[PDB]
Design an enzyme around this catalytic site. Structure first.
Site, short mmCIF file in Angstrom:
data_model
loop_
_atom_site.label_atom_id
_atom_site.label_comp_id
_atom_site.label_asym_id
_atom_site.label_seq_id
_atom_site.Cartn_x
_atom_site.Cartn_y
_atom_site.Cartn_z
N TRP A 83 0.83 -1.23 0.00
CA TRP A 83 0.00 0.00 0.00
C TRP A 83 0.85 1.26 0.00
CZ3 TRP A 83 -3.40 -1.81 4.83
CH2 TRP A 83 -4.25 -2.86 4.41
N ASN A 121 1.17 -1.16 -10.20
CA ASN A 121 -0.25 -1.01 -10.48
C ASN A 121 -0.98 0.07 -9.68
OD1 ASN A 121 -2.77 -2.08 -11.73
ND2 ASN A 121 -3.29 -2.29 -9.53
N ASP A 206 4.40 -7.38 -8.44
CA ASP A 206 3.05 -7.62 -7.90
C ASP A 206 2.02 -7.35 -9.00
OD1 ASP A 206 1.34 -8.09 -5.49
OD2 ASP A 206 0.59 -6.08 -6.01
N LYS A 209 -1.30 -8.82 -13.79
CA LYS A 209 -2.45 -8.88 -14.74
C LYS A 209 -3.32 -7.63 -14.72
CE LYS A 209 -5.79 -11.37 -11.86
NZ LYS A 209 -6.67 -12.57 -11.81
N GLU A 230 3.79 -11.74 -10.80
CA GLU A 230 2.65 -12.41 -10.21
C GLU A 230 1.47 -12.24 -11.14
OE1 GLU A 230 -0.07 -10.48 -7.83
OE2 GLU A 230 -0.76 -12.33 -6.79
N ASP A 297 -0.86 -15.38 -0.04
CA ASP A 297 -2.17 -15.16 -0.64
C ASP A 297 -3.05 -16.39 -0.71
OD1 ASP A 297 -1.45 -12.48 -0.98
OD2 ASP A 297 -0.58 -12.92 -2.96
O1 LIG Z 1 -4.88 -4.68 -0.63
C1 LIG Z 1 -5.53 -5.81 -0.12
C2 LIG Z 1 -4.48 -6.91 0.04
O2 LIG Z 1 -3.28 -6.26 -0.25
C3 LIG Z 1 -2.15 -7.08 -0.25
O3 LIG Z 1 -2.37 -8.08 -1.23
C4 LIG Z 1 -1.29 -8.07 -2.11
C5 LIG Z 1 -1.03 -9.54 -2.39
O4 LIG Z 1 -0.86 -10.19 -1.14
C6 LIG Z 1 0.14 -9.61 -3.36
O5 LIG Z 1 0.71 -10.87 -3.69
C7 LIG Z 1 -0.48 -9.08 -4.64
O6 LIG Z 1 -1.64 -9.79 -4.98
O7 LIG Z 1 -0.83 -7.75 -4.42
C8 LIG Z 1 -1.78 -7.47 -3.40
C9 LIG Z 1 -1.98 -5.97 -3.30
O8 LIG Z 1 -1.03 -5.37 -4.12
C10 LIG Z 1 -1.88 -7.61 1.16
O9 LIG Z 1 -0.80 -8.53 1.21
C11 LIG Z 1 -3.15 -8.22 1.72
O10 LIG Z 1 -2.96 -8.32 3.08
C12 LIG Z 1 -4.41 -7.40 1.48
O11 LIG Z 1 -5.56 -8.16 1.81
O1 LIG Z 2 -7.90 -7.36 -3.18
C1 LIG Z 2 -8.03 -8.78 -3.13
C2 LIG Z 2 -7.41 -9.43 -4.39
O2 LIG Z 2 -8.16 -8.97 -5.52
C3 LIG Z 2 -7.79 -9.54 -6.76
O3 LIG Z 2 -7.98 -10.95 -6.67
C4 LIG Z 2 -9.02 -11.37 -7.51
C5 LIG Z 2 -8.39 -12.28 -8.57
O4 LIG Z 2 -7.68 -11.54 -9.54
C6 LIG Z 2 -9.52 -12.99 -9.27
O5 LIG Z 2 -9.01 -13.85 -10.26
C7 LIG Z 2 -10.41 -13.71 -8.25
O6 LIG Z 2 -11.46 -14.31 -8.98
O7 LIG Z 2 -11.00 -12.72 -7.44
C8 LIG Z 2 -10.01 -12.13 -6.64
C9 LIG Z 2 -10.62 -11.18 -5.60
O8 LIG Z 2 -11.51 -10.31 -6.26
C10 LIG Z 2 -6.30 -9.28 -7.06
O9 LIG Z 2 -5.83 -9.86 -8.29
C11 LIG Z 2 -5.42 -9.76 -5.93
O10 LIG Z 2 -4.11 -9.33 -6.22
C12 LIG Z 2 -5.89 -9.19 -4.57
O11 LIG Z 2 -5.13 -9.94 -3.62
CA LIG Z 3 -4.30 -1.12 -13.33
#
Ligand SMILES: OC[C@H]1O[C@H](O[C@H]2[C@H](O)[C@@H](O)[C@@H](O)O[C@@H]2CO)[C@H](O)[C@@H](O)[C@@H]1O
Ligand SMILES: OC[C@H]1O[C@H](O[C@H]2[C@H](O)[C@@H](O)[C@H](O)O[C@@H]2CO)[C@H](O)[C@@H](O)[C@@H]1O
Ligand SMILES: [Ca+2]
Ligand SMILES: OC[C@H]1O[C@H](O[C@H]2[C@H](O)[C@@H](O)[C@@H](O)O[C@@H]2CO)[C@H](O)[C@@H](O)[C@@H]1O
Ligand SMILES: OC[C@H]1O[C@H](O[C@H]2[C@H](O)[C@@H](O)[C@H](O)O[C@@H]2CO)[C@H](O)[C@@H](O)[C@@H]1O
Ligand SMILES: *[C@@H]1O[C@H](CO)[C@@H](O)[C@H](O)[C@H]1NC(C)=O
Length: 476
Positions: A83, A121, A206, A209, A230, A297
């Site tokens: 964040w 992002n 991070d 997609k 990722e 995650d």
């Molecule tokens: O913002 C909500 C979510 O943020 C973070 O999630 C990361 C995730 O864990 C990363 O691997 C990648 O998906 O990006 C996300 C946000 O950039 C926190 O780690 C998580 O605690 C929180 O729910």
């Molecule tokens: O903020 C929570 C997460 O949101 C997205 O995760 C999606 C994922 O892309 C999608 O394929 C699945 O069906 O739904 C989840 C939650 O809406 C982000 O891509 C993640 O990075 C975040 O952790």
């Molecule tokens: Ca974007």
């Protein structure tokens, strides 16, 4: 360090806030449900590098380093690094620029690499998307830098996945307009400077997609190091194409069937076997992907089952698969936390025992992988080949003929009966003596060229030619 450089590496992935505190306590409270800084720092990691290196890892991946939103939100603090608000400052919770530089040097002094997690992002904000004061973001200190506020609703509309915002009105993640030249120019500038300032060897990117693909080449270039993205999708037809804009991606395709195959004694070996083959063929380069079964995650592996033999087989697979093994801090201590935040347990609360069963298994698995690579320049480009499967077994082969590691994995679990698998297709020469390098036992290939593999307690077996072991410290 380049993609080719990275092929041979093995990564220990850790949350900086959760791995090691500066004072080195193994008892400092960290209640994961509180979602607050627990006080892990970069100095802490440095002090615990022997622990990490003792398991045979050659690199670490740490969570993002940029300065975060300062608040304790309704979802806790930004202890995880995702964040950010000021990309030109460091998160003071973990230390100073001097500490991060010291971490890089300490790794380099032990022949290890530093990988750093980065987000392009979004920024993060405590509050509703409508309430955002874009002036708090440095350097993106205007609404002009961001996509219009809307949340991602439809994940089958890739444009909306890229142009709308992640998060919610509790913690919003203002979405940078990565289609603007000023936004591209700033991030490209930024990532090159980050890498040079901190002598960073590779990046984990991070939320890949969520940014349009054309952004990524310039960013991977500007970084000048291996980048592994990722891309959160199990479908290799969705995920593998990202390898056409970035050096590698995390192996989410392998993740789901790998988890399924070992999380219970009725897991599907077939789905794993097939996805190995699918990824080998369809993904640009399976050997530049990151193999994992546990991260911050998803529920940890032991959250599905505490069977230690199952945990041992899945860990052995991660190390011996194509691509870069990635083990998430606490996996080696059989941590069992579920979904975020339960899977961000503090590693120090384990006491960091180096004689735990997983620590030993991982050490022996990385030991043979590292050794094999040192003797076989084709090991890392040889695409892991599944040679056998049955309802409870999968076998696979990797390495140049005459130097191959042949791995036999089981989902029979710790109560598994003893028996002998007659393994065909391993390609060793009749009457060759092999060492099973996990249990340090010897096996002799049949005169028919089959390998009689003794199976017991659902334990993984990893075979290598005993002659090739000469001089090493393996199975002494
Ligand atoms: O913002 C909500 C979510 O943020 C973070 O999630 C990361 C995730 O864990 C990363 O691997 C990648 O998906 O990006 C996300 C946000 O950039 C926190 O780690 C998580 O605690 C929180 O729910
Ligand atoms: O903020 C929570 C997460 O949101 C997205 O995760 C999606 C994922 O892309 C999608 O394929 C699945 O069906 O739904 C989840 C939650 O809406 C982000 O891509 C993640 O990075 C975040 O952790
Ligand atoms: Ca974007
Ligand atoms: O022998 C060199 C070659 O072996 C492997 O290729 C396997 C392939 O993976 C299987 O799907 C099947 O076609 O048999 C091949 C061997 O004949 C490695 O995957 C490959 O990288 C290596 O060059
Ligand atoms: O959760 C399982 C995953 O299913 C999808 O990916 C499929 C894909 O349709 C196909 O290539 C193959 O046969 O199976 C994979 C993996 O099971 C989703 O796209 C993933 O995100 C799902 O999690
Ligand atoms: C790297 O250091 C230079 C000079 O100290 C500074 O201008 C730049 O902002 C730094 N880059 C990053 C990403 O910290």
């Amino acid at each position: 360090a380049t993609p080719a450089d990275w092929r041979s590496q093995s990564i220990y992935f850790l949350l900086t806030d959760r791995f090691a505190r500066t004072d080195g306590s193994t008892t400092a409270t960290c209640n994961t449900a509180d979602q607050k800084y627990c006080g892990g720092t970069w100095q802490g990691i440095i002090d615990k590098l022997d622990y990490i290196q003792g398991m045979g890892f050659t690199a670490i991946w740490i969570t993002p380093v940029t300065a975060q939103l300062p608040q304790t939100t309704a979802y806790g603090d930004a202890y995880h690094g995702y964040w950010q608000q000021d990309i030109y400052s460091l998160n003071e919770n973990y230390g100073t620029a001097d500490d991060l530089k010291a971490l890089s040097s300490a790794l380099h002094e032990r022949g290890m690499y530093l990988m750093v997690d980065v987000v392009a992002n979004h920024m993060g904000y405590d509050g509703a998307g409508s309430s955002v004061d874009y002036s708090v973001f440095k350097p993106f200190s205007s609404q002009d830098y961001f996509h219009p506020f809307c949340f991602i609703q439809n994940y089958e509309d890739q444009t909306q996945v890229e142009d709308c915002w992640l998060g919610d009105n509790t913690v919003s993640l203002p979405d940078l307009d990565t289609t603007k030249d000023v936004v591209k120019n700033e991030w490209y500038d930024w990532v090159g400077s980050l890498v040079s300032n901190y002598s960073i060897d590779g990046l984990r990117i991070d939320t890949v997609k969520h940014v349009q693909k054309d952004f990524w080449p310039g960013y991977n270039k500007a970084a000048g190091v291996y980048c592994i993205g990722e891309v959160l999708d199990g479908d290799p037809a969705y995920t593998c194409p990202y390898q056409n804009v970035m050096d590698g991606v995390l192996n989410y395709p392998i993740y789901y069937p790998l988890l399924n195959a070992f999380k219970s004694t009725s897991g599907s070996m077939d789905d794993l076997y097939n996805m190995i083959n699918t990824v080998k063929s369809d993904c640009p380069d399976s050997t530049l992907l990151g193999t994992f079964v546990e991260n911050h995650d998803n529920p940890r592996f032991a959250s599905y089952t505490n069977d230690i033999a199952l945990a041992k087989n899945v860990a052995a697979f991660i190390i011996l698969n194509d691509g870069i093994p990635i083990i998430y801090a606490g996996q080696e201590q059989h941590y069992a936390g579920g979904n975020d935040p339960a899977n961000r347990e503090a590693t120090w609360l384990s006491g960091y025992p180096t004689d735990s069963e997983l620590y030993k298994l991982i050490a022996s698995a990385n030991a043979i992988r590292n050794y094999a690579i040192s003797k076989d320049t084709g090991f890392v480009t040889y695409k892991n080949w599944p040679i056998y499967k049955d309802d409870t077994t999968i076998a696979m082969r990797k390495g140049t003929d005459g130097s191959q590691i042949v791995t036999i994995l089981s989902n029979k679990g710790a109560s598994g009966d003893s028996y002998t698998l007659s393994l065909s297709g391993a390609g060793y020469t009749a009457g060759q003596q092999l060492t099973e390098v996990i249990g340090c036992t010897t096996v002799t290939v049949g005169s028919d060229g089959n390998v009689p593999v003794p199976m017991a307690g659902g334990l993984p077996r990893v075979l290598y030619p005993t002659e090739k072991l000469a001089g090493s410290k393996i199975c002494s």
